Symmetry: none
Subunit: 143 residues, 6 copies
């Protein structure tokens, strides 16, 4: 099972001692990343994600090529967590976002290069009501 | 995590190993599970199929257009996620195999307003180039 | 409100009761009215139709591509409004019945630069689910 | 005639003693709203519209479900009044926007829920020239 | 060769004593414009372009009709220089943009009106690496 | 300007006068040139064609899916530029004639990491109205 798309989502959604899931994928030649953000605002998210990605070894500190792939992978997922009008993710206060990044060779490293994916699991809660909605998103790019 | 129809619904779509075990576990908790596949990525062939699989199996009953509607929208939105932008320009005998999941129930916390319907799809897309496939993923969640 | 081709044009499309009364009232004021229907939501079958209905009835004359052009763009833009995003993924024997209105004249205030052309459409969309229809609405306004 | 789409536009465009048209639709189980704004900027409009909607009884003060439907209904109409690039509605100074909101059961309340629509009639005037352009927009959503 | 699309791009890309190319097209009933900007941010670009266009005789100082056509022509090209998510052109620092505007009658002025085009040639360089990427864009509108 | 595959690639697409002179000039500098035409604006008929013309002429070799892939993406992106938005709603026997250029080599400065592939297209679009054509232009640049 080398689906860089299916894996990430599964990673994002699995709160089953994630520490192990990670090491399992790292040990399987993968670059993993996990995080959270209190906003569905394009900029917030990207900046937040750009850092968690550079700190962990997911992407080089200075490389346009990889940042485009990442940014792009994120924009895709971002159009999903926000139901359609990405701009609307700005207006939503009291929200939360679980992101998961994964980077590696999807085709068993046979005459192929690296790819990248960004899973976004967003929930919209209210002060009284706990959670009012759930949103999913997945961006998948090649480097 | 606790009782989140969308997450549940996805975790169900994504793991296709001992489905009966994960599905009976699901119904056992006041839930309505229905899965299927679609060899098409056409709005009509998908809604038609899902429309039937959902209905054929007690997920939603057939009488008023209401339940039929709350599913439609869930489907539509999840479908809008499947077909996005890179997919926009891929409509020539594209080998499309869509696996789907539908889940009906109430993410009951306390309030218990009414029930929800959560439709999520996950298929693959064959590209014109050899040895290349694209993953698609969509989720529509609507209150019935 | 006073002499606004777009508003006029819309108020004309929307009210289909005693059209001859509202249309003669319109021409009587140095205007050019032309209405029709289209059972298609294809760019070509719409422009072709509108192209003819407009021309067949003295809205625009047939000689240079100019007038034919100023209409095209009006149409195109109003058509871009009809087909938007939710509509994007609805292209399977979708029962589409489009009613349209074209209005040619000058929203003369004082300046009187030249004439305008205002094309607005308003059809319906049948969804795959039963008992469900979607309204579409578009308006293209261009100076000839 | 229960077309929540056709009605609203007709409402927006009719300056025929609107007070009566309203009461007519209210009396016919409809939630009406009317307004104006001097900007075609996404945020302006939405915020402006969000208020006129909550003050009148069109939407609950605290409910994510209805605000999404509203916001969405608006975004649709907003892509229209602005000819295509919604971002461009920001650059346009000296403009004006007449909005009309309507909420109720389009299918005679038979085993069905509420829907919503947002009509936007925008005009672009200049200091010398009165009005240089007219723009129309309609967003229609289900709650 | 009256392709207002092909010309502009050719103009943009040709660093062959551009002064002559211009005069050649001006002398051939064309309104030309050339420029540069250090940002792929929608607003930057448009404002930057709006000025170079009004100063040179490409567009009237006060006219909604021509500014829409221009703005639109730019938005098109702008979605190209930025690979897909125009918003992402904001995040890119250390960039550069060569723009070329052209306005005139594409169909030999026979019973036809003016059109407009905006070529955008953008390069993404880094402090060490010279240039990491090249982007092209073309917006074409009718006035 | 100096050795910029994209600019080169475009300047090549755009000028169709003494191509052999501009192409031999190109190869003479450690480059790989390949041009062609496509009477289609379908994702598959374009990639298929380009796939072959590129491969048929030593631009990219046929063995691993890698090179086939780095071209695909270049193509796809340049194709996404050709089909944009106004084009979105123009899919009825639209007379589409696409001229394309592919260029493979290294925009070698000093670093010489690896080679690049630059695909750019430039066709025309016939509109339903008479005497009307639309220019399309796209460029995809990817590192192999």
């Amino acid at each position: 099972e080398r689906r860089i798309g299916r894996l990430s989502v599964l990673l994002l959604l699995n709160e089953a001692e994630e520490s192990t899931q990670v090491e399992e994928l790292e040990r399987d030649g993968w670059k993993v990343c996990l995080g959270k953000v209190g906003s569905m605002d394009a900029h917030k998210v990207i900046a937040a994600i750009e850092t968690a990605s550079k700190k962990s070894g997911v992407i080089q500190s200075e490389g346009y090529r990889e940042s485009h792939a990442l940014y792009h992978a994120t924009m895709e997922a971002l159009h999903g967590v926000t139901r359609g009008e990405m701009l609307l993710g700005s207006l939503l206060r009291t929200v939360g976002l679980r992101f998961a990044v994964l980077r590696g060779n999807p085709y068993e490293s046979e005459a192929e290069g690296d790819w990248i994916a960004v899973s976004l699991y967003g929930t919209i809660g209210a002060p009284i009501k706990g959670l009012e909605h759930e949103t999913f998103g997945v961006g998948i790019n090649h480097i």
